[PDB]
Symmetry: D2
Subunit: 285 residues, 4 copies
């Protein structure tokens, strides 16, 4: 069967669920999943993901959209999107030196545990061409020269635009992205990075965490923003470490943690379970 | 504010959520929480817990019930219940020799983390009278004599009936309950017990688990049934153990695990998040 | 640098650690990891794993082994072993229809997370030939015909001998192994399989479970033994399930659980961290 | 039976385990637990905890201590300690407005899960007098007036001295302690407090967090030091949060996290499982 997903965010008022479930009912659909959240009882914002089925979710789609928009969307000033499971989001993976993130994604993709359409892997290094190509996926090596940054980014954009990339995944890509680039992929660029307690801003954090004697290693997957501030956090987790682990053993623990947290975030983004509002997310698991 | 909770279970058909959220909307309520589950897309059974607020949830209650029953309940052959947070379920704790379960409950109750009204603690032993009374709660020691079982149970029932006990919690009560007794507390008697992998039916399981070299200890909180088969499982969890732990150390791990799992189940039952159907539960966390 | 590992098991006696470490000291070795365990304070059996490095673990090895046998071993009646990290254990993987456990092993092996030397994969089905050989590993299909089981085992055994397999992993191999077969691999056959709370013995476990309303799913890896009883358990773990997950998604989590649990017991074995005594194990992680 | 614990720390050298265990053996002791650690393979510092029992740990103790000092200690330049389980450490608890951390300590102490000898509770508020004294523990209220902080510390110190406090626990004590105060309790003051990913420095942490859309909350227990920097971390842990939880329920989970995390570091300390070297700790659990 075909599963349609209705993602909705709007100002919190009474009757949104009644309106939506009621609209869907009149169009002969059957809710298979319904979740909602309100940042505040009265006032604030409303969030809802509704997964459902219905006969002929084909040419019956543009019409389903027109009606929802006229009948419900406009009434509640809703921000929404109707997504179908059969749809496979054209994605791209940018990567630099580290390969733990990329590999987990490629493999999880290969055994069919990530519902996407991986179009290509872009890297400012050649290191992974062999492994990536063995998966039947285009590997594009486009160097990132000093000052010649704009040089590189132009190619990358053309590349993604040519392929119709809807999602860009930074699998430990070590180069910064100008606000202009990020501007073309709003809440469409997922990134991963190391976290700690307390936070460790410096050179070789995995040496500073060990130096402070931390008992935890964190990792944070988030949406990338032009904004001066880190984008909407998607997922966060930690791996326990003890006096036992050496800078060598912590790094391995942190990678396993990173590739896991990142895949989790990508899987969620692909299953359409992430709703963004302001600089936070509402993840409907 | 006052929080009202609508628990509903019925045969799965399209339009239940539309009907319920729509009814609540017309009665000027605001959904603060909505969760639902369907055992099967088409066919099967429907479950839903709706927490909400509204002005004057007082004398506006019996009327809210009449309408829901005439307008929604009868239409969908629903099994339902309207519960209020201000309501404090009159409960009772039966206990025998072990005290880990009872203590966790008493304390969690004392620091206000269990929304109930503990009326009394019944025991077929005297062991805990001192601790229980220090909490300002009646301790009733009613022996359970050989063959004179019916003798004991009569007192216990009279006791609970006199107090208006709505929930009975077996905090490691070591005596069996005749089907007649259980018959007066349908899905109102929560119990806790040890679990393993593989299961260990015998004398001194905590010696057989250690003897088999298990790496896990389990505990299961469930509703008690006259039925020959263990009642609806509410919650289940495990605690990891290694070659290191001795029968002495496993027992301590299993108790900490039991009192935790049991309190969790009681807290859920009290917050009205447990829906029973057949011999399973749908817990809305 | 070469990491030597000393695994020792013997009747618990005072002074075993003194004798073992004193010996290693005299031989100019430095202990990098030391772990011990005693089943009982008085009497019982002692277990210990000592990882150390030393100048010239070259042909200095045989002498190291002779000296330990004479000076410490015979004296304490210990069953021991001295392994070298660089000795990648020649292993084989048996598999039937299900591929989740096989794939995990293959990928973790390729990414270097499993220190072994995969020599071959054997199956009573041809299904996985393409994928396994894509990893550069020989695929040998040996059907298992009712009545002709005898003939199958002999071939399987010929292949393992010709390859000098030291470890046999059953990644969800669905065919029974005769005691005659197992007798040839004392504590050298690791198997994986389902587990539930309560347990289940029938057709469709992930069915009788969804049926009982369990909140957990268990997986158990263990060495295989000739006798009736299941062999020493190596690792056990769980995955939380609920009302949300379906009978389908319950099987998916069960696979991801098994694959992780089995790969873990394999790595611990390959890393020489498992000691067996009776029908239980000591795992020094 | 009396369990003796030998905590040792010294410049990593070959033969330390040989010398320590050989010594204990000669003195007729039996090792029940042995754990060691080396920060670096070559050079660095060695850490070790040995739990053992022995015939007549009576006045045989001073001799045991003399002999170890002469034969092993001075030789390896080790900072060591020999603790006896029966020596219940005299401890004190400081607390301000928040009571969650205090209550947990009090209850776990009463139920016997914290091997210590609570001598007193001191607060710059009178709020908890009734509850603390209900546990049979003296309550001493010492206000902290701006400008009169000096006068407060002196009294607090007089109370601790008169009681012979060996361990000072800060169960969310909201007042600053002068270096002069801390200097009197080298590695003897355990404190607890919030932590986030990313961290937060302002008014209302559980506000700036709900603000950033974090999915975790952290708590860190650690010894207090005179210097600017936070002292050696003892334990760290987390609690997952989401969109579901509110700013209210985020504080509730944060309390339950802190109380558990602090009580854990306290028990490990009381059980002599913490060794400090520089600004980090080694925790042998």
């Amino acid at each position: 069967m075909e599963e349609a997903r209705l993602l909705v965010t709007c100002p919190d008022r009474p009757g949104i669920v009644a309106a939506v479930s009621g609209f869907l009912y009149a169009h002969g659909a059957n809710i298979t999943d319904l979740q909602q959240h309100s940042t505040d009882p009265e006032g604030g914002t409303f969030f809802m993901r509704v997964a459902f089925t219905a006969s002929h979710l084909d040419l019956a789609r543009p019409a389903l959209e027109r009606a929802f928009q006229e009948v419900v969307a406009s009434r509640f000033q809703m921000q929404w999107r109707l997504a179908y499971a059969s749809e496979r989001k054209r994605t791209a993976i940018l990567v630099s030196k580290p390969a733990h993130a990329l590999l987990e994604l490629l493999w999880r993709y290969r055994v069919g545990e990530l519902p996407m359409e991986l179009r290509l892997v872009i890297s400012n290094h050649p290191d992974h061409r062999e492994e990536v190509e063995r998966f039947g996926i285009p590997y594009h090596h486009v160097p990132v020269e000093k000052g010649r940054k704009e040089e590189a980014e132009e190619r990358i954009l053309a590349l993604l635009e040519a392929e119709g990339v809807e999602l860009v995944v930074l699998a430990r890509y070590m180069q910064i992205l100008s606000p202009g680039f990020v501007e073309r992929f709003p809440m469409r660029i997922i990134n991963i990075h190391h976290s700690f307690l307390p936070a460790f801003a410096g050179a070789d954090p995995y040496r500073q965490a060990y130096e402070r004697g931390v008992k935890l290693i964190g990792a944070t997957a988030h949406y990338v923003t032009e904004e001066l501030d880190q984008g909407p956090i998607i997922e966060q987790d930690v791996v326990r470490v003890s006096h036992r682990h050496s800078v060598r053993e912590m790094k391995r623990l942190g990678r396993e943690l990173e590739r896991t947290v990142l895949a989790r975030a990508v899987r969620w983004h692909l299953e359409d379970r992430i709703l963004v509002h302001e600089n936070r997310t509402v993840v409907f698991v």
